[PDB]
């Protein structure tokens, strides 16, 4: 029942749901299908508000950071916002919670979320709000119970632009590795993680559970995906993250600042290319520069672009933009391919939410990767396969999609979407509304 990733005209027909006539005389009586995506996150609740730069330093914060805070310092901040009646919005959050939420909206298929949740949920609470607000098709039944509160992210915006985060973890890192459902990760087409998962008070089991999901991920050949949580967290130990990506990660989500922190390259293109030594596919959100994508394709199946060749540190880096991504392991003679797209319709008027924008362009990519798993099980004999790809569409096309989604997330306050993209009406549908 999954939607098509993007709005481009496709050469091959996409079924959308298995009840399709041609597909019904086609599929077997016993049909599995049902392709999904799973991620791990620190169950969080955003509490957004604008504040003075005085409010920032008064609580030991720095602009543009994501800093954890002590429990007593947080209650002091919580009380000052209710006193001054400064709170503007309360909604679900989490770099990966947002991503799973946006995935379900874009594809209208299920996503499983792994994390924590109050064992007893009272109405009107932060844990309650998290549920009423989470997307419908996002599945929260596999969460784990905790006797404490879920996490609170005090998103402080201040003057136009930089959005500061202050985290009251609560029990958000109390996820145990026994709570990782083996069967869910096996039938997944990607496992999505964020750099914030290692940031925890020592001894908390979240990292223990995260590595356990990766165990299952490797068992069943499920790509591991990683998004990053600010430049400062990474620059502390760049070589540790580098070593981590080689062993486990297969897909890397990133922005230009987070990337230079990892590679030492002020050029996103080079940072992304240097990253390809460690992972199979890289997405780099460069803010106003646009976004880049770098990955691998089979050298025999390369498709050369029809756009002008772009200049860059790597000459003509989009030369095979129209190739689809494969995992390095699945290639016989892997070839590096790169692509870049500029902001949609010249970008927004207002800078707005640049933090959750990257977390959204990622969801677009996940959609395309799931779509490949979905269309492969429903139409296996298709020209779209018998080569073992990673993405259903080409890098150029996936950029086209993810770029359009980021524009959606930037042009609104929240980082979570509630409405998918508008698809084209055919002639019949068009005349219907015009009649």
Ligand X SMILES: Nc1nc2c(ncn2[C@@H]2O[C@H](COP(=O)(O)OP(=O)(O)O)[C@@H](OP(=O)(O)OP(=O)(O)O)[C@H]2O)c(=O)[nH]1
Ligand Y SMILES: Nc1nc2c(ncn2[C@@H]2O[C@H](CO)[C@@H](O)[C@H]2O)c(=O)[nH]1
Binding residues (CB under 5 A) for Mg ion: these are 227, 358
Q: Is 397 in the site for ligand X (CB under 6 A)?
A: yes
Q: Is 386 in the site for ligand X (CB under 6 A)?
A: no
Q: Is 43 in the site for K ion (CB under 5 A)?
A: no
Q: Name which of Mg ion, ligand X, K ion, none residue 134 binds, using a CB cut-off of 5 to 8 Å depending on partner kind.
A: K ion
Query: For residues 375-384, b (16+ Cβ closer than 10 Å) or e, as one string?
Result: bbebbeeeeb
Q: How far is the C-alpha of 298 from the C-alpha of 336, rounded, in Å?
A: 9
Binding residues vs ligand Y (CB under 6 A): 41-42, 44, 46, 66, 93-96, 98, 153, 165, 167, 194, 196, 199, 229, 276-280, 328-329, 355-356, 359, 415
Last residue before each gap in the chain (C to N over 2.5 A):
none
**Closest approach of Cβ 138 to ligand X, in Å?**
26
State whether residue 93 is helix, strand or coil.
strand
Q: Name which of Mg ion, ligand Y, K ion, none residue 273 binds, using a CB cut-off of 5 to 8 Å depending on partner kind.
A: none
Q: How open is the CA angle 289-292-296, to the nearest 5 degrees?
A: 165
**Closest approach of Cβ 278 to Mg ion, in Å?**
17
Q: Name which of ligand X, a copy of itself, Mg ion, none residue 393 binds, using a CB cut-off of 5 to 8 Å depending on partner kind.
A: ligand X
Rounded to whole angstroms, what are the CA distances from 63 to 159, 232, 254, 328?
10, 12, 20, 39
- Feature table: binding site for ATP: 285-290, 358, 403
- From 206, 185, 183, 215, select the one nearest 39 (Cα to Cα): 185
**Closest approach of Cβ 257 to ligand Y, in Å?**
13
C-beta closer to ligand Y: residue 7 or 89: 89
- Give the neighbor-by-neighbor strand order of the sheet with 66-68: 66-68, 164-168, 151-156, 44-49, 87-93
C-alpha torsion sign, points 75, 78, 82, 84: positive
Please identify which residue in the block is written with the tokens 């219907």: 432
Q: Is 111 in the site for K ion (CB under 5 A)?
A: no
Q: How far is the C-alpha of 397 from the C-alpha of 319, rounded, in Å?
A: 14
Applying CB under 6 A, among 384, 405, 410, 416 the residue interacting with ligand X is 384
C-beta closer to K ion: residue 113 or 209: 113
Question: Which residues ranging from 117 to 156 are in contact with K ion (CB under 5 A)?
Answer: 134
Residue pair 227/253 in contact (Cβ under 8 Å)? The answer is yes
**Closest approach of Cβ 435 to ligand Y, in Å?**
29
C-beta closer to ligand Y: residue 35 or 417: 417
**Residue 196: DSSP 8-state:** G
Q: Name which of ligand X, Mg ion, a copy of itself, none residue 187 binds, using a CB cut-off of 5 to 8 Å depending on partner kind.
A: none
- Feature table: binding site for GMP: 41-46, 94-98, 199
Applying CB under 6 A, the residues found at the interface with ligand X are 10-12, 303, 322, 384, 393-394, 396-397, 400, 434
């Amino acid at each position: 029942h999954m939607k098509f990733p993007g709005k481009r005209k496709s050469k091959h027909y996409f079924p959308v749901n298995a009840r399709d006539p041609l597909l019904q005389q086609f599929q077997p009586e016993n049909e599995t299908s049902a392709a999904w995506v799973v991620g791990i996150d620190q169950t969080l609740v955003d509490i957004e508000a604008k504040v003075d730069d005085e409010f920032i330093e008064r609580y030991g914060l720095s602009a543009g950071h994501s800093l954890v805070i002590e429990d007593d310092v947080a209650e002091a901040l919580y009380q000052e916002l209710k006193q001054k009646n400064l709170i503007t919005h309360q909604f679900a959050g989490g770099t990966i919670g947002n991503t799973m939420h946006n995935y379900s909206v874009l594809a209208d298929d299920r996503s499983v979320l792994l994390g924590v949740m109050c064992s007893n949920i009272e109405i009107g609470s932060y844990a309650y709000r998290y549920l009423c607000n989470t997307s419908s098709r996002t599945d929260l039944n596999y969460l784990q119970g905790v006797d404490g509160p879920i996490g609170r992210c005090f998103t402080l915006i201040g003057e136009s632009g930089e959005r500061t985060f202050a985290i009251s973890p609560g029990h958000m890192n109390q996820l145990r590795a026994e709570s990782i459902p083996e069967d869910v990760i096996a039938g997944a087409s990607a496992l999505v993680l964020t750099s914030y998962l290692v940031r925890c008070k020592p001894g908390e089991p979240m990292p223990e559970a995260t590595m356990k999901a990766i165990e299952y991920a490797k068992k069943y050949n499920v790509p591991v995906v990683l998004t990053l949580g600010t430049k400062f967290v990474i620059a502390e130990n760049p070589q540790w993250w580098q070593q981590f990506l080689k062993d486990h990660v297969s897909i890397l989500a990133m922005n230009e600042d987070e990337a230079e922190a990892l590679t030492g390259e002020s050029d996103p293109l080079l940072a992304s290319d240097k990253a390809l030594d460690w992972v199979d596919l890289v997405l780099c959100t460069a803010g106003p520069i646009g976004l880049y994508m770098a990955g691998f394709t089979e050298d025999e199946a390369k498709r050369k672009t029809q756009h002008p060749l772009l200049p860059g540190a790597i000459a003509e880096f989009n030369q095979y933009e129209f190739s689809r991504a494969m995992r390095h392991k699945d290639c016989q003679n892997p070839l590096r391919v790169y692509s870049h797209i500029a902001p949609y319709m010249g970008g927004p008027e207002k800078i707005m939410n640049t933090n959750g924008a990257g977390d959204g362009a990622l969801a677009a990519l996940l959609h395309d990767i799931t779509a490949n798993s979905y269309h492969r099980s429903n139409v296996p004999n298709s020209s779209k396969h018998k080569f073992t790809w990673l993405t259903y569409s080409s890098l150029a096309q996936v950029c086209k999609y993810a770029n359009r989604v980021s524009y959606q997330v930037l042009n609104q306050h929240s980082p979570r979407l509630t409405r998918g993209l508008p698809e084209r009406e055919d002639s019949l549908e068009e005349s219907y509304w015009d009649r």
